[PDB]
């Protein structure tokens, strides 16, 4: 009996959204950051 | 009977084959945290690890027994599942 | 069930050797109740010569001794060594069952091999029982998966953490602490361990759950192997010699009070290398411990084993959990100074319950109160918790002239 391969609890959208908001908030480029700071600042399912 | 845990079920001879409100749990309140605060100190495939279903998910709580001769429901042997979503193992 | 007869339709294969062709059939009914009545009373009366000549075969000569009782006619030819041979005929629409006799040459029967000669009826004496048993003289009857190496492995770290000494436990204590590879083995280990503290149900032995515990004391020691797959199976048996009420066989003189507080460290230490905010391990544990304490009707040890676990936690928790409810010292002290049984089990379990009680919360008083504390004791409940936080506070200025 093996369990299920379980699956990550985010999208591949949602993780590739991750990877973009945090790359971008490392400040390479300073509107880049100040769009994903106000990206995290109002998008409604950053939640989870 | 003859998987892990046989020398138990040998051993047993069985042969058949207000401080309950949300926030005082929340770990603001109940963790040291003030210790971390570091003083003169010296994606196609998943980019993040996927946790125990079970432990993050499963009502756990319900194998705890609480009172031996009175248990609520009835606990039955539990089979090896051999998860494969666990690294280090072969299979 | 049912009276069983021979059938009507062989009375009328029977009429026609006769040579009668119409035979209607209320005589083939008249006929067939008629002689299976007279073959049961024949059967029935070789049955008294196989029973009084004590045989148990219902040979043929049983027969003949009842027709010739019955007055009937021999049945001539019977006593021929044979069997119950038959030669089915298919034929063009009459099916039937006949004989197929043979012939023999007449000089073949006067030139057979003769049978040896019979012997004589003698008798023999020997012993059957000799004031016992019976004597053995022949005249008596006689009378995915484990390989094998760490199969191996498995079977003598399993059996010896299971009593027989405490030398081979501790150094297979010290193999489960301190192994690289023992991956592969942690879902069988995890099996065994939350297996072995369910079987403490049915035989409430305090030492294999001690030794249980310390097993599992043991695979957390270890570097190389991550239990963050099984924690969810090791946290079920830990909270089970945590907060379950009958620990001990004798509950007077086992002290369960040890493996209540060492299971409570374990679980302290098990939510601190494991909480993690999706896991919420703390928050479910102390919810658990939370509303194990606060409700009432539960016993003495059930309640020690959540302060135990509530106070091992830290210091936040008892501030916000445990300092609530210390007016409950007085529904224990109900019981303690005062109570109409004395020689029940509830005092023991109670004045530990207390003595726990009062050496948690006195570095809790000793951080949220004045230095003098003068009279905190007869403003604290009982006005012995107060005692404590006085001797708390000395022992804090002797460690601090220490350091």
């Not at chain 1, 700071?37 to 409604?44: C, K, N, Y």
């Not at chain 3, 057979?112 to 019976?134: F, M, N, Y």
């Not at chain 3, 676990?309 to 210390?326: F, M, N, Q, S």
């Not at chain 3, 529904?331 to 003595?355: F, K, M, T, Y």
Request: net charge negative.
């Amino acid at each position: 009996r093996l369990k299920p391969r379980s699956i990550h609890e985010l999208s591949v959208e949602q993780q590739l959204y991750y990877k973009e908001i945090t790359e971008a908030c490392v400040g390479s480029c300073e509107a880049k950051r100040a769009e994903a700071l106000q990206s995290i600042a109002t998008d409604p399912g950053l939640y989870q | 009977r003859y998987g892990p845990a046989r020398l138990w079920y040998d051993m047993l001879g069985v042969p058949e084959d207000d401080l309950l409100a949300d926030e005082n749990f929340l770990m603001v309140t109940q963790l040291h945290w003030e210790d971390d605060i570091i003083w003169d100190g010296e994606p196609w495939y998943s980019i993040f690890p996927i946790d125990n279903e079970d432990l993050v998910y499963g009502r756990w709580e319900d194998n705890i027994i609480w009172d031996a001769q009175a248990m609520p429901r009835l606990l039955e042997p539990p089979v090896l599942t051999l998860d494969p979503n666990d690294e280090n193992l072969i299979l | 069930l049912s009276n069983t007869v021979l059938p009507s339709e062989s009375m009328k294969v029977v009429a026609e050797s006769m040579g009668i062709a119409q035979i209607q059939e209320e005589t083939c009914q008249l006929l067939t109740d008629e002689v299976s009545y007279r073959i049961k009373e024949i059967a029935q009366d070789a049955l008294k010569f196989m029973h009084m000549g004590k045989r148990q075969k219902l040979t043929t000569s049983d027969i003949d001794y009842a027709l010739k009782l019955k007055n009937v006619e021999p049945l001539y030819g019977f006593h021929a060594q044979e069997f119950i041979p038959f030669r089915f005929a298919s034929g063009g629409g009459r099916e039937l069952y006949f004989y197929e006799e043979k012939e023999v040459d007449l000089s073949d029967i006067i030139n057979t091999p003769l049978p040896r000669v019979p012997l004589d009826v003698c008798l023999k004496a020997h012993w059957l029982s000799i004031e016992g048993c019976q004597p053995a003289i022949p005249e008596n009857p006689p009378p995915h998966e484990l390989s094998v190496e760490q199969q191996l492995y498995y079977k003598e770290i399993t059996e010896a953490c299971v009593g027989s000494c405490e030398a081979k436990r501790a150094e297979a204590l010290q193999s489960i602490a301190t192994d690289p590879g023992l991956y592969q083995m942690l879902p069988r280990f995890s099996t065994f361990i939350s297996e072995g503290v369910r079987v403490n149900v049915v035989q409430n032995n305090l030492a294999l759950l001690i030794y249980l515990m310390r097993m599992v004391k043991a695979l957390m020691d270890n570097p190389t192997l991550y239990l963050e797959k099984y924690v969810h199976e090791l946290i079920p048996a830990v909270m089970t010699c945590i907060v379950s009420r009958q620990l001990c066989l004798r509950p007077d003189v086992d002290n369960h009070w040890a493996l209540r507080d060492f299971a409570a460290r374990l679980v302290a230490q098990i939510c601190k290398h494991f909480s993690t905010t999706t896991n919420n391990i703390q928050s479910r544990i102390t919810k658990t411990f939370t509303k194990s304490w606060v409700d009432e009707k539960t016993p003495w040890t059930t309640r020690y084993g959540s302060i135990a676990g509530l106070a091992e936690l830290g210091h936040d928790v008892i501030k916000t959990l445990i300092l609530p409810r210390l007016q409950q010292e007085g529904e224990r002290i109900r019981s303690v100074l005062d109570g109409p049984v004395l020689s029940n089990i509830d005092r023991i379990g109670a004045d530990h319950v207390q003595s726990l009680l009062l050496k948690h919360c006195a570095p809790v008083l000793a951080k949220l109160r004045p230095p003098p504390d003068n009279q905190d004791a007869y403003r604290a409940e009982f006005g012995s918790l107060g005692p404590l936080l006085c001797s708390q506070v000395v022992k804090a200025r002797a460690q601090a002239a220490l350091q």
